[PDB]
Amino acid sequence: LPFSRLAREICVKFTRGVDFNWQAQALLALQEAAEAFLVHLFEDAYLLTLHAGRVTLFPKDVQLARRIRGL
């Protein structure tokens, strides 16, 4: 999806100027980093949920998995 424009609606707010042209490799790297972050966070949260005995995820559990590490 062209979610890139929706992502840039907040950066253009901070820049107060014309949106800069981002390379295709730049968007690819951003998407890969986002996927890596999401998969790492989800795996970490699921580990502690299964430790608690549950099988499904929860907002509290992913919130804890985020807060335990650095912010």
Binding site: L38, P59, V62
Partner: protein, 65 residues
């Protein structure tokens, strides 16, 4: 308005090796993605307006972490 969809969350989660996902976690995933994108764009804007060049993207964004 909201560019984050349920199959997008579910495919990445299943890639992560989870089994079941609550429907109440979509808002939290949207929030964590939002703060992450805010962080990366803040680093990128810092790197662009601190460097002389403006149009190019500083690849040093990797070394911020």
């Amino acid at each position: 308005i909201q560019g984050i969809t349920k199959p997008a969350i579910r495919r990445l989660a299943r890639r992560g090796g989870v089994k079941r996902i609550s429907g109440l976690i979509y808002e939290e995933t949207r929030g964590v993605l939002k703060v992450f994108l805010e962080n990366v764009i803040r680093d990128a804007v810092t790197y662009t307006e601190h460097a002389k060049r403006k149009t190019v993207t500083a690849m040093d964004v990797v070394y911020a972490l």
